[PDB]
Amino acid sequence: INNTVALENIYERIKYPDDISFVENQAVTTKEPIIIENVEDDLARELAFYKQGVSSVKAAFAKLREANVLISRPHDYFAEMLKSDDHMEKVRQELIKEATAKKLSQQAKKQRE
Amino acid sequence: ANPRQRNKQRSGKPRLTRRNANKKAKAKIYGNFVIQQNWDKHATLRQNYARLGLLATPNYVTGGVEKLYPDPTLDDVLDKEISIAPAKTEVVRQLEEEAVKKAARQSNKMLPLSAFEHAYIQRLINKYGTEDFESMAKDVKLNSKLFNGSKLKNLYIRMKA
Amino acid sequence: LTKRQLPERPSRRKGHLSKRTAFVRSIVREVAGFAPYERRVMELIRNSQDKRARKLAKKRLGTLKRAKGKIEELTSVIQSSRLAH
Amino acid sequence: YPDYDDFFTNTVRETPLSSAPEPKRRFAPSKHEQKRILQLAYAIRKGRI
Amino acid sequence: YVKTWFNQPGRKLRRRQARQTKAAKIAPRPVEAIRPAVKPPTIRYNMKVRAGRGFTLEELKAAGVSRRVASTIGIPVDHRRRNRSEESLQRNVERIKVYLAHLIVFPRKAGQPKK
Amino acid sequence: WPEYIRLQRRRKILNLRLKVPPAIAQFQKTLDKNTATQVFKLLNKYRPETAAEKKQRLVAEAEAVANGKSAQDVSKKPYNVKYGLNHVVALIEAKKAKLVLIASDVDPIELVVFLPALCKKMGVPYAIVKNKARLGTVIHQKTAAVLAVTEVREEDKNELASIVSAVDANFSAKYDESRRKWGGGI
Amino acid sequence: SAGFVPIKQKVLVLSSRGVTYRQRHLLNDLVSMMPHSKKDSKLDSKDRLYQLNELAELYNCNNIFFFESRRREDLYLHIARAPNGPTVKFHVENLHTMDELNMTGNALKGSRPILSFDKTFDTAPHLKVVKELLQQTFGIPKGARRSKPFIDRVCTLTIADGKIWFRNYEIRENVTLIEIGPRFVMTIINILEGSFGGPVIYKND
Amino acid sequence: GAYKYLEELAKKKQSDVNLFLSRVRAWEYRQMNVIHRASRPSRPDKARRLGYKAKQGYVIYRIRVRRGQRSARCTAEERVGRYCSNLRVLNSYWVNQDATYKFFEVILVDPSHKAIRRDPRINWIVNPVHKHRESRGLTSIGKKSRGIGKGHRFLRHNTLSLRRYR
RNA sequence: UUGACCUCAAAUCAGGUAGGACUACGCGCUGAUAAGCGCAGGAAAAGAAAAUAACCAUGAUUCCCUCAGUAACGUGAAGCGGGAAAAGCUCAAAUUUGAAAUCUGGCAACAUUUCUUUUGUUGUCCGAGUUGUAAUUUCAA
RNA sequence: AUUGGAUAUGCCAUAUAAAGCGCUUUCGAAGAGUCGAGUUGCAGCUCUAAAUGGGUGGUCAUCUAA
Structure with a gap:
């Protein structure tokens, strides 16, 4: 088992060309070996992925600068979104009840004085 | 209490009184007559069966039987059987006698032939003899029923005896 | 333990075509003709729009196993109709 | 509306189709009659026919 | 919406009575037929033995009882169970061969036409 | 017009105005008047015995047996035309029939629609004749669907080899393209 | 003909029998x-x-x-x-x-x-073969139908103690990584030599 | 016989022959009544297979049903069984359809006829337990509808079981 | 002119048949299980595997205890095991083709009765049935 | 007095018959607008099969629906 030489040969058989542009590749791997060892802390790995993503987003946008592609999309553009419309309407209504408790949290804590 | 049953009680016509329920009278034996003799009506079923020699079940019993007194390899199984399992208490031995003498007069199964069945074989046997039955399934005329090579011998035993 | 080889159940022989049933289907295959999508496929199997032909059978039948069985079914018709006609 | 594709029934098959052998009851007197005769023959001895 | 068990002494006796009324007709023959010995199928119970449904078609052929004369003399048949190993077959021939050794079938009168 | 007659002329014409498939198209082209008067003349010897007078010969067979005589030893194999749909499909598959006759008015037409295809394959000369009831009169029935000669005696073999040659030469030898094209739409 | 309007990445989402809603x-x-x-x-x-x-x-x-x-x-x-x-x-x-x-x-x-x-995927050649395969799978090729040229999603792959943790994030102008919603714990089982066939390359253990 | 050929032909339902008889008979079935008696079964093989013997007492009906929510075949068993109050339902099969109507037939058996009553293969239906079988969901398609089969696919807890000794 | 056959009608024709009531328990229908609708019996539904299992295999259905408040997702099983009871089978699909061997009905005799009230047999004449009634067989073969 | 399955026995029966199991140089038919996929509230609509096939479960095991 674990025939890495054959896997490397498979990596040679599935060897995507390095001459492809980063915009053409549509991928930016984190240069640092990002290892968030906090298996217990989910918030630690969430920010580490965000930090590695931000490091990638900085590198990808720089690579997109060479590609001269519109990294930012127009807000006036009304193209198809990944998120559904009715679910997003319920998503905004879901956050209304959370801030309502937070508003009552800040008011009552200030009312404790 | 009920509309149906307020009716009969407020009336003056007697209820259809049917006394039909007493326990402890365990159903008397019919079907067999010998077991009707040695049955005692008060004793339960499993105490009659295992007194006069027989079983209520050949399998296991799923309970603790009554105790009243302080009681003190494939070649040899597909061929050899257990013995006759001889009879105790003489009533399962009486059942031996009824099951042998009835099958002693109703044992003979010889069949006399009919007038035709005798003559049909008679005509066949005088044309080829009394041994070569196997070619009589190839006889054109006298085997008009197209009988077997075996079936003619079946009648031929019935011919003599 | 000392395991035996058992014979086959006489019910496991369901799904095996006889010589009399295969002669029944062959007769009725032509005397009933072809359905108003199976006329379409026979044209596309004749002028070799093979990838287009297999695309329609999957869409109409539902499953490749059926969508391959027809191919094998209908291609036998054309290769036997070139000797009849 | 095409013509008639007789791709299969174009030729003639020479063999029979069912292969189970000819039974013996097609080469002898009809044993259903022979039973039927004995019902009538019995009926004469009882004097109903 | 309950399930009250006040009849539980009564179903015991009703079963007891109807098990004695079963025996009234069958006075010389058992109230239940002989069941085979079959091993339970799970990993948990495969060392146990218990009564099953009936004797297979080759447990019964090997003992001398045809499938047609079987259910007359009170021997259940299971057309579904099959004997995978000899041990499943040698154990149950010695259920039949003891049963035939201990059983006495009363004879009957036949209908041979005379004259 | 009554409530049903205006259907009774319209299902006459909708069989004409529509597109008849070549399997059904041959069920209106039919054996003619002339050659459909000799087929039934040959068959009118080989009718099945009327059920009343089969019994009549059975009481005359069962009276001598009650005395001692017999005729089963000298009974020669009988003859008649063979009828019934399920008995004649097996008489063609076994290549026993020699002249199959198909009615032209079987109400569910699927009952006989495989027979002109089966007779073409098994090499049994066939013809489609009119009036299922006309076959029914042959065999003492109300409506027959098909008949078949499988064996005439040595008397009419020479007649049968001639009358079949009229059946192929008029039905099978002709009608060869109207069975291979759609019908109706008149 | 055999290929027209040819996109490099064509996938087939074939389900199985008995998936819940x-x-x-x-x-x-x-x-x-x-x-x-x-x-x-x-x-x-x-x-x-x-x-x-x-x-x-x-x-x-x-x-x-x-x-x-x-x-x-x-x-x-x-x-x-x-x-x-x-x-x-x-x-x-x-x-x-x-x-x-x-x-x-x-x-x-x-x-x-x-x-x-x-880099953990890039560490083991068995994972490196999967990493390049994952690079070719989840990424849309050049000129996909009904595709958008801009970037609105951010895919992050982290092998959480031998199991790849999917992380689809959506960026906002400042990278402001916010999870798009697609995130699953993907633990590899084995690898076949061919197209759903051939000898097994490795058991994962 | 002919029933072998008539089963395999009845499966090729969309082919030219099976489609031509579909258009023709849907015309005649539509000008007739909504429920009208047959004299012969249109599919004399399916009827023969589903139970219909061609003797006196076996009555074939046929009924169109509107398409487009009880299963249509089940209602064809009920609506014919409410039109015949004496006949006992055996089965009901499919014979034709179009864009607006499914046509079925039904096999019905007279329980009072002293030819059914003398026949020990159909004598189970003279018994009074089989009164309006199509009502109780007790027939070929009323069993399939209510998930009565054998398989993991297809008050007993809602009551507390309080024994004497516990 | 005439005769079959198909279809459709008519009859205070001959003989039968269906409603309606009870609805504790049964089975369906839709349904906020409740209500409403429909349909039977002394029981009914279920039923002799297009079933589980992964074993040294079990063996129609029903029911009780257990599995178990367990797996699975507040809801909530099922296999196994332990009991009670155990009875199996019938058609379609192969030609009776050396013989529609099948059955309803009308009439007449002979019986027979829970019964002058019941239920049959035999003879006879139509009729049903070859678009298939009997014998044979149901995969265990 | 009505009725049960039996026991013995009398008369009839029609048996030229029927059945069990060896033995096979032979044959061995198996249920469709259903299964199935797509899709709306097990139903609806669109489409529509096959013969070692088809179903449900781990290449195997086990079953034989309409």
Whole structure:
């Protein structure tokens, strides 16, 4: 088992060309070996992925600068979104009840004085 | 209490009184007559069966039987059987006698032939003899029923005896 | 333990075509003709729009196993109709 | 509306189709009659026919 | 919406009575037929033995009882169970061969036409 | 017009105005008047015995047996035309029939629609004749669907080899393209 | 003809028999996530999977997916390439639902995302073969139908103690990474030598 | 016989022959009544297979049903069984359809006829337990509808079981 | 002119048949299980595997205890095991083709009765049935 | 007095018959607008199969629906 030489040969058989542009590749791997060892802390790995993503987003946008592609999309553009419309309407209504408790949290804590 | 049953009680016509329920009278034996003799009506079923020699079940019993007194390899199984399992208490031995003498007069199964069945074989046997039955399934005329090579011998035993 | 080889159940022989049933289907295959999508496929199997032909059978039948069985079914018709006609 | 594709029934098959052998009851007197005769023959001895 | 068990002494006796009324007709023959010995199928119970449904078609052929004369003399048949190993077959021939050794079938009168 | 007659002329014409498939198209082209008067003349010897007078010969067979005589030893194999749909499909598959006759008015037409295809394959000369009831009169029935000669005696073999040659030469030898094209739409 | 308007990345989202509604919603989420895929009808040959190559040859696809619903109890996933390639079966569980109120990402349908690959995948050649395969699978090729040129999603791949943790994030102008909603615990099981066939390359242990 | 050929022909329902008889008979079935008696079964093989013997007492009906929510075949068993109050339902099969109507037939058996009553293969239906079988969901398609089969696919807890000794 | 056959009608024709009531328990229908609708019996539904299992295999259905408040997702099983009871089978699909061997009905005799009230046999004449009634067989073969 | 399955026995029966199991140089038919896929509230609509096939479960095991 674990025939890495054959896997490397498979990596040679599935060897995507390095001459492809980063915009053409549509991928930016984190240069640092990002290892968030906090298996217990989910918030630690969430920010580490965000930090590695931000490091990638900085590198990808720089690579997109060479590609001269519109990294930012127009807000006036009304193209198809990944998120559904009715679910997003319920998503905004879901956050209304959370801030309502937070508003009552800040008011009552200030009312404790 | 009920509309149906307020009716009969407020009336003056007697209820259809049917006394039909007493326990402890365990159903008397019919079907067999010998077991009707040695049955005692008060004793339960499993105490009659295992007194006069027989079983209520050949399998296991799923309970603790009554105790009243302080009681003190494939070649040899597909061929050899257990013995006759001889009879105790003489009533399962009486059942031996009824099951042998009835099958002693109703044992003979010889069949006399009919007038035709005798003559049909008679005509066949005088044309080829009394041994070569196997070619009589190839006889054109006298085997008009197209009988077997075996079936003619079946009648031929019935011919003599 | 000392395991035996058992014979086959006489019910496991369901799904095996006889010589009399295969002669029944062959007769009725032509005397009933072809359905108003199976006329379409026979044209596309004749002028070799093979990838287009297999695309329609999957869409109409539902499953490749059926969508391959027809191919094998209908291609036998054309290769036997070139000797009849 | 095409013509008639007789791709299969174009030729003639020479063999029979069912292969189970000819039974013996097609080469002898009809044993259903022979039973039927004995019902009538019995009926004469009882004097109903 | 309950399930009250006040009849539980009564179903015991009703079963007891109807098990004695079963025996009234069958006075010389058992109230239940002989069941085979079959091993339970799970990993948990495969060392146990218990009564099953009936004797297979080759447990019964090997003992001398045809499938047609079987259910007359009170021997259940299971057309579904099959004997995978000899041990499943040698154990149950010695259920039949003891049963035939201990059983006495009363004879009957036949209908041979005379004259 | 009554409530049903205006259907009774319209299902006459909708069989004409529509597109008849070549399997059904041959069920209106039919054996003619002339050659459909000799087929039934040959068959009118080989009718099945009327059920009343089969019994009549059975009481005359069962009276001598009650005395001692017999005729089963000298009974020669009988003859008649063979009828019934399920008995004649097996008489063609076994290549026993020699002249199959198909009615032209079987109400569910699927009952006989495989027979002109089966007779073409098994090499049994066939013809489609009119009036299922006309076959029914042959065999003492109300409506027959098909008949078949499988064996005439040595008397009419020479007649049968001639009358079949009229059946192929008029039905099978002709009608060869109207069975291979759609019908109706008149 | 044999190839016209040819996109490099063509995938087939073939389900299995017995996926729950929540188990099916994630598959339809990846259908929306991967616009370079073509979802087909279910294959009732739930174990004869070696004949799926012709189905890929019918649609002229390049990527495959057979989300085998294990025993109608769990949910699995396997993927391969049209010409033999790596057929690496994996186990999928602990997925973040894409229809819940917790996920609050903002991404566009068909937007070419940015995929992030960890060096742990680049460490083992067995994972490196999977990493490049993952680079070719989740990424849309050049010129996909109904695709968007801009980037609205951010894919982050982190092997959480031997199990790849999917992380689809949506960026905002400042990178402001906010989870789009697609996130599942993907533990690899094995790898076949060819296209859902051939000898086993490795058991994962 | 002919029933072998007539089963395999009845499966090729969309082919030219099976489609031509579909258009023709849907015309005649539509000008007739909504429920009208047959004299012969249109499919004399399916009827023969589903139980119909061609003797006196076996009555074939046929009924169109509107398409487009009880299963249509089940209602064809009920609506014929409410039109015949004496006949006992055996089965009901499919014979034709179009864009607006499904046509079925039904096999019905007279329980009072002293030819059914003397026949020990159909004598189970003279018994009074079989009164309006199509009502109780007790027939070929009323069993399939209510998930009565054998398989993991297809008050007993809601009551507390309080024994004497516990 | 005439005769079959198909279809459709008519009859205070001959003989039968269906409603309606009870609805504790049964089975369906839709349904906020409740209500409403429909349909039977002394029981009914279920039923002799297009069933489980992964074993040294079990063996129609029903029911009780257990599995178990367990797996699976507040809801909530099922296999196994332990009991009670155990009875199996009938058609379609192969030509009776050396013989429609099948059955309803009308009439007349002979019986027979829970019964002058019941239920049959035999003879006879139509009729049903070859678009298939009997014998044979149901995969265990 | 009505009725049960039996026991013995009398008369009839029609048996030229029927059945069990060896033995096979032979044959061995198996249920469709159903299964199935897509899709709306097990039903609806669109489409529509096959013969070692088809179903349900781990290449195997086990079953034989309409």
